[PDB]
């Protein structure tokens, strides 16, 4: 229940607390009062819990304060977050509430190691290296409170201030949204007055029409609009990737038009709620294949401007100043949300236990240890990879393994693939490229209701460590179906060499 190795005593222990609009000044007078007071070691995560509760989606952000305990504070790292489990294994009373007990003197004398108080620690969240602190309200009164930042003060639009701050974490998408807002406004205006564009508007049914005809018309609008000099960079960077095609801008606009009614358009929170549940926003953001391609102020402004003009056109055909106002404001917030996710450290597909999703298949390391190939010893290791597919039966042709004579050979007897429990042995051969190819001895298919475990076993005959120079690739390649140049569907599981 408690990780002693991660627990410690600190003089002048501080942390951070996200603060709602209206409370940034009053909090600095003290910590008063919801059954516990929460803080974190990361001021950027604190920035997260600083948005107005009435309008969580698009509301104003307050700020972040820093709180410090005088004297010695004992930080007690917890293994579990279960109140009952905790009071049980510690030998504490199972009656009184745990956090109340934590502030008692008998508790502090026993777990404090001489500290004036105990603060409980828990991993902030899955996928985060931050910690969350749980503070007893009484003990919390000792906290001095200092301002870290007040987002309001910055006097910026929407949630720009909060996101600009968060982006400091990565020293990285760090855009000036002021510039983007100004350019977006400029381009939408210049686009409305452009002759060729004014023309195409005049060819609009301007009435509720078939969805198919609306899309057809919007695609033509897109094509003509994209020819405007103030959208020239956008024309170039969107000319090649299918995700960024006119068809996808048109599909987005028609979708926006279909979900936005009068009352929705009139409220920013309601508009954000509605836009936030739509598919296809990546086309407008310039986001595909794990990358944010639209990452200059100039290009983001152009895409948002084009989108806005098209939504304007869609409303009459399948659905007001919404297009240039709430829609722009709202979509800017969604951009910021997504950009923020991409700025955060995370595992790419096929790394650790994140699946690799491709051609209808899904594969992943069974556990994190599987994805590690330990080195510098003699002996065997085993590595499990889960494999399935979405619907109809799709084949698994085999697997490509990195091998190093002596330092990393395939154990051909222990390597196998199990399909719904049917254990299938494999035939393994070294091929051109410092790679061993294994094929199943019976046909393998996966699909809805049929899954496999590929078990890779490695053998080490030398105690010598693998130099990062002797491996050609950092991935195990699982091969799916074949599709005058033959090619296999390639499913990658990425590993790390350790120890």
388 or 436: CB nearest a second copy: 388
268-275 vs 326-343: helix crossing angle, rounded to 10: 60
Of the residues 70, 97, 379, 406, which one makes contact with a second copy according to CB under 8 A: 379
- Out of 26, 82, 93, 296, which residue is the one contacting a second copy (CB under 8 A)? 82
Measure the CA–CA gap between 201 and 103, rounded to whole angstroms: 69
Q: How far is the CB of 291 from a second copy (least distance, A)?
A: 8
Q: Which of 89, 106, 126, 132 is catalytic?
A: 132
Residue number, 49 or 111, with CB nearest to a second copy: 49
Q: What token pair was written down for 385?
A: 């990879």
Nearest CB to a second copy, comparing residues 139 and 283: 283
Triad 75, 81, 86: Cα angle to 5°: 80
Closer to a second copy at the Cβ: 72 or 237? Answer: 237
Positive or negative: CA dihedral 204, 209, 212, 218 = positive
Residue of 91, 195, 229, 290 interacting with a second copy (CB under 8 A)? 290
Distance of alpha carbon 131 from its chain centroid, rounded? Answer: 18
Say if strands 37-40 and 8-11 run parallel, antiparallel, or are unpaired. Answer: unpaired
- On whether the CB atoms of residues 177 and 157 are closer than 8 A, the answer is yes
Instruction: Please report, as residue ranges, which positions from 425 to 484 form the binding site for a second copy (by CB under 8 A).
Output: 425, 427, 441-443, 445, 447-453, 455, 481-483
Query: Which residue precedes each gap in the chain (C to N above 2.5 Å)?
Result: 33, 171, 319, 483
Count the alpha carbons within 13 Å of 273 in the hemisphere toward its beta carbon. 13
Q: How many residues belong to the site for a second copy (CB under 8 A)?
A: 94
Map the footprint of a second copy across residues 128-187, applying CB under 8 A.
128-130
Q: Which is nearer to a second copy, 19 or 73 (CB)?
A: 19
* Among 102, 119, 251, 285, interactor with a second copy by CB under 8 A: 285
Of 134 and 305, the one with the shorter C-beta distance to a second copy is 134
Among 118, 260, 281, 400, binds a second copy (CB under 8 A): 281
Rule CB under 8 A: choose which of 103, 316, 355, 376 binds a second copy. 355
Residues 21-40 that bind a second copy (CB under 8 A): none
Decide if residue 45 touches a second copy (CB under 8 A): yes
**49 labelled ligand-binding:** yes
Scanning 19-27, 275-283, 300-308, 429-437 for contacts with a second copy by CB under 8 A, the matching segment is 275-283
Least separation, in Å, of the C-beta of 89 and a second copy?
14
Is 132 among the residues known to form the active site?
yes
The site map against a second copy for 385-424 (x = CB under 8 A) is: -x-xxxxxxxx-x----------------x-x-xxxxxxx
Q: Does 342 count as an annotated binding residue?
A: no
Whole-number minimum distance, CB 240 to a second copy, in Å? 16
x-or-dash string of contact with a second copy, 53-72, rule CB under 8 A: ---xx---------------
Query: How many residues does the structure list for the chain?
Result: 499
One of 282, 329, 434, 474 touching a second copy (CB under 8 A): 282
Residue 358 touches a second copy, criterion: CB under 8 A: yes
344 binds a second copy (CB under 8 A): yes
Burial class, 490, CB count within 10 angstroms (exposed 0-12 / middle 13-18 / buried 19+) = middle
Q: Does 288 bind a second copy (CB under 8 A)?
A: yes
Q: Does 283 bind a second copy (CB under 8 A)?
A: yes
The span of 63-71, 111-119, 226-234, 329-337 binding a second copy (CB under 8 A) equals: 329-337
Cβ distance to a second copy smaller for residue 44 or 69: 44
Restricting to residues 89-118, which ones interact with a second copy according to CB under 8 A? Answer: none
| Residue 272 lies near a second copy (rule: CB under 8 A) | yes
Beta strands 445-446 and 394-395 are antiparallel
Annotated binding site: 17, 49
Enzyme catalytic residues: 132
Known binding-site residues for NAD(+) equal 17, 49
């Amino acid at each position: 229940v408690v990780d002693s190795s991660k627990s410690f005593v600190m003089e002048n222990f501080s942390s951070y607390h996200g603060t709602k609009p209206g409370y940034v000044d009053s909090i600095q007078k003290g910590i008063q009062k919801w059954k516990e007071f929460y803080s974190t070691d990361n001021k950027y995560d604190a920035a997260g819990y600083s948005v107005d509760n009435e309008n969580p989606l698009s509301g104003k952000a307050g700020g972040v304060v820093k709180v410090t305990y005088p004297g010695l504070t004992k930080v007690l790292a917890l293994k579990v977050d279960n109140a009952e489990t905790i009071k049980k294994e510690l030998g504490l009373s199972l009656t009184e509430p745990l956090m109340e007990q934590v502030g008692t003197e008998e508790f502090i004398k026993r777990f404090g190691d001489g500290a004036s108080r105990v603060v409980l620690s828990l991993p902030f969240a899955e996928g985060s290296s931050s910690v969350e602190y749980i503070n007893n309200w009484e003990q919390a009164k000792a906290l001095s409170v200092e301002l870290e930042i007040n987002f309001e003060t910055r006097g910026k639009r929407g949630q720009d201030a909060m996101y600009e701050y968060m982006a400091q974490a990565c020293a990285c998408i760090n855009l000036d949204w002021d510039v983007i807002r100004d350019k977006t406004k400029t381009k939408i205006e210049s686009l409305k007055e452009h002759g060729p564009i004014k023309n195409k508007m005049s060819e609009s049914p301007n009435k509720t029409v078939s969805e198919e005809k609306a899309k057809q018309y919007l695609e033509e609008f897109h094509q003509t609009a994209l020819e405007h000099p103030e959208l020239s960079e956008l024309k170039t960077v969107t000319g090649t990737n299918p995700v960024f095609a006119g068809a996808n801008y048109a599909a987005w606009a028609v979708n926006v038009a279909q979900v936005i009614d009068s009352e929705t358009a009139d409220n920013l929170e309601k508009t954000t709620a509605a836009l936030s549940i739509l598919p296809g926003i990546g086309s407008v953001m310039g986001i595909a294949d794990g990358a944010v391609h639209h990452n200059t102020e100039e290009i983001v402004a152009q895409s948002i401007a084009l989108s806005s003009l098209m939504v304007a056109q869609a409303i009459p055909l399948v659905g007001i100043g919404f297009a240039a106002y709430n829609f722009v404001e709202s979509i800017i917030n969604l951009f910021q949300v997504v950009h923020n996710s991409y700025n955060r450290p995370a595992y790419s597909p096929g790394h650790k236990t994140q699946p690799f999703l491709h051609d209808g298949y899904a594969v992943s390391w069974n556990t994190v240890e599987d994805s590690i190939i330990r080195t510098g010893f003699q002996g065997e290791s085993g590595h499990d990879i889960k494999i399935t597919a979405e619907n109809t039966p799709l084949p698994i042709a085999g697997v490509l393994l990195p091998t190093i004579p002596g330092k990393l050979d395939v154990n051909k007897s222990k390597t196998h693939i199990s399909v719904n429990g049917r254990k299938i042995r494999m035939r393994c051969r070294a091929i051109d490229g410092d790679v061993t190819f294994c094929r199943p001895k019976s046909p393998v298919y996966v699909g809805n209701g049929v899954h496999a475990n590929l078990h890779v076993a490695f053998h080490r005959s030398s105690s010598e460590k693998i130099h990062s120079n002797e491996i050609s690739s950092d991935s195990i390649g699982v091969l799916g179906y074949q599709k005058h140049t033959k090619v296999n569907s390639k499913l990658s599981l990425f590993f790390e060499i350790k120890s």
